């Protein structure tokens, strides 16, 4: 698998998505996201579904007001649930809670029983939580290199 998938509601959650992608790529994790490539159009869906179903080990969902009830994110969650059931992996979708307005009383049904990582108070605590979770769950990784993120 070797790749980490990030699903977000473009173009509202771009700042945090860029920050997180750069930090993770600077730590040795291969990240697939819709903001790292400047070419679009052909196979706008095939490639994404192929990557989710074939070579994705982790699915990270940026849970916020914009991403709730967003069609593309919902389809992504459906494919992710299918793959998660196929792999018999209990911890495959890891929501990230970044919005203060989105109460936990009003989250999507597909992610309502799952333990979410909190980013509302401070982003560094959220990053520490993500790194500790990845280490505990043995997410494959490269030796951390910030030059990847710089490039």
């Amino acid at each position: 698998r070797n790749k980490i998938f990030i699903s977000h509601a473009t173009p509202d959650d771009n700042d945090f998505t860029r920050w997180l992608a750069l930090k993770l790529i600077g730590l040795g994790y291969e990240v697939w996201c819709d903001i790292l490539f400047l070419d679009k159009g052909v196979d706008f869906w095939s490639n994404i579904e192929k990557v989710i179903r074939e070579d994705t080990c982790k699915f990270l969902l940026v849970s916020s007001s914009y991403s709730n009830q967003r069609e593309g994110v919902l389809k992504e969650l459906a494919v992710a649930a299918k793959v998660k059931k196929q792999l018999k992996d209990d911890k495959f979708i890891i929501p990230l809670a970044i919005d203060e307005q989105l109460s936990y009383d009003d989250i999507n049904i597909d992610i309502v029983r799952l333990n979410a990582i909190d980013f509302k108070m401070s982003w560094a605590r959220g990053l520490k939580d993500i790194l500790e979770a990845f280490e505990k769950q043995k997410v494959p990784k490269e030796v951390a290199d910030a030059s990847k993120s710089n490039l």
């Binding site: 700042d15 860029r18 920050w19 600077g26 401070s122 982003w123 560094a124 993120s149 710089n150």
Partner: protein, 469 residues
């Protein structure tokens, strides 16, 4: 149809031996060069000032955004940028009641009330320093607006203490020098800019679109003052020593007694960066003259040479003096008598008073940053302010002015002089900006000079820059 040349960006060095041309991006990607464990702060002011400071600290532990992330890089939060802790629990409070302030800011004589208020703050600071068991890294002074408003020289309210300046900040910094206490003065309206308004319901200063820039600036200043190294230069060639010079009026004295202060910079042979002031204010009695008498020139150059030799082990192979004024012949001969055999001495002059502007004929954006018109082998115009393509904007608003660089004394290469001068614009630790319009050898010397001129009781002052900025 003359010709212009282009000079590339100097690049600066960050953690893990990685280089970048931006301090914000380099710090938000890799991190600083050394490892502070935390910043224990000491706050002095009213209760409202303490509340405002706590509010601000709680604020900057989290990401902060600008309206245009391309133009102004974001702030990902203090402890993620700097890998150290600076929060609102290591704070220590020392009250300054309004009763203390009321009885002093009424004398109607600016000098006496400035003296009294400076004393009111510094006596508490020194008492806390000498007779308490904490270990405070920096002292943060929350100054109510009225204290700063009227303590200016030429601002009116609508002998023993006359040997001091008429400025709160300068006198405050000068009278704390023999104690060596790092300090950061904050206006009350800066930390809480939302609640200070006018007769329109709007802020006096609107930081809404530039909050991340403010966070960057304050965080970098606080980090440097506690003993941090944010960044260093990239490829400073060994054996070269830079030396700024700036003259300052003395004002309240029988004679103008022009004071001259310097700033020294070189490579420490450990691939570090030694950037400290080489100062003991040298004087000239004649009025209106900005030249040193031979004895002071001899002493100054000898002191600088000795500093370099002690910090390295052998004399410089090349010394550059950057000044804002020309050098007469007696001063240069004085310099030359006390200079070793195998050391080349070059004196340069950087000026802004020269009308020359270049307009792009096509668009609405200004000239590029690295450009330069070389008038001769001993003169050139260097643009240090202009359009920077990395951030997609210009560092100024209107058509910028170039710097006029002249090789007044010695023999060197103007291309090397221009390249070096451009690379010295990247070490402004008092700011978190892409680049500065002036070399910092000429800007920190000025800041030293304008602090140790608000008093006369200072003898053998400290050299480290963190006691003046």
């Amino acid at each position: 149809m003359k010709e212009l040349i282009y000079i590339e960006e100097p690049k600066i060095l960050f953690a893990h031996g990685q280089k970048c041309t931006d301090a914000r991006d380099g710090l938000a990607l890799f991190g600083p060069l050394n490892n502070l464990y935390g910043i224990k702060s000491g706050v002095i002011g009213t209760k409202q000032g303490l509340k405002i400071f706590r509010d601000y600290l709680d604020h900057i532990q989290k990401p902060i955004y600008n309206s245009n992330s391309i133009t102004r890089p974001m702030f990902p939060g203090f402890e993620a940028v700097f890998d150290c802790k600076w929060e609102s629990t290591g704070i220590t409070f020392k009250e300054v009641t309004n009763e203390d302030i009321g009885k002093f800011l009424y004398n109607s004589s600016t000098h006496k009330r400035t003296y009294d208020l400076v004393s009111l703050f510094i006596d508490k600071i020194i008492s806390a320093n000498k007779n308490e068991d904490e270990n405070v890294d920096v002292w943060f002074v929350i100054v109510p607006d009225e204290i700063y408003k009227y303590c200016r020289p030429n601002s009116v309210l609508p002998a023993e203490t006359y040997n001091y300046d008429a400025q709160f900040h300068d006198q405050f910094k000068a009278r704390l020098l023999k104690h060596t206490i790092p300090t950061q003065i904050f206006r009350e309206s800066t930390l809480a800019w939302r609640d200070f308004k006018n007769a329109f319901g709007l802020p006096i200063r609107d930081f809404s679109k530039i909050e991340g820039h403010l966070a960057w600036t304050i965080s970098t200043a606080a980090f440097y003052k506690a003993g941090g190294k944010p960044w260093k230069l990239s490829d400073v060639r060994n054996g070269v020593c830079y030396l700024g010079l700036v003259y300052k009026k003395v004002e309240k004295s029988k004679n103008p007694r022009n004071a001259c202060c310097a700033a020294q910079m070189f490579l420490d042979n450990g691939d570090g960066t030694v950037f400290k002031g080489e100062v003991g204010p040298w004087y000239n009695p004649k009025n209106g003259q900005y030249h040193l008498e031979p004895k002071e020139a001899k002493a100054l150059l000898s002191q600088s040479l000795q500093s370099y030799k002690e910090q390295i082990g052998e004399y410089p192979k090349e010394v550059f003096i950057h000044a804002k004024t020309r050098f007469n012949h007696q001063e240069w001969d004085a310099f030359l008598e006390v200079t070793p055999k195998e050391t080349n001495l070059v004196g340069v002059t950087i000026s802004k008073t020269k009308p020359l502007k270049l307009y792009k004929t096509e668009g609405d954006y200004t000239i590029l940053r690295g450009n330069a018109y070389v008038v001769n082998e001993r003169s050139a115009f260097l643009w240090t302010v202009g359009y920077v393509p990395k951030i997609q904007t210009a560092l100024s608003m209107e058509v910028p002015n170039p710097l006029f660089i002249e090789i007044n004394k010695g023999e060197a290469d103007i291309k090397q002089v221009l390249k070096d001068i451009l690379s010295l614009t990247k070490l402004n630790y008092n700011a978190c900006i892409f680049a500065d319009g002036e070399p910092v050898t000429l800007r920190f010397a000025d800041k030293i000079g304008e602090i140790l001129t608000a008093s006369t009781d200072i003898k053998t002052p400290p050299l480290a820059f963190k006691y003046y900025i």
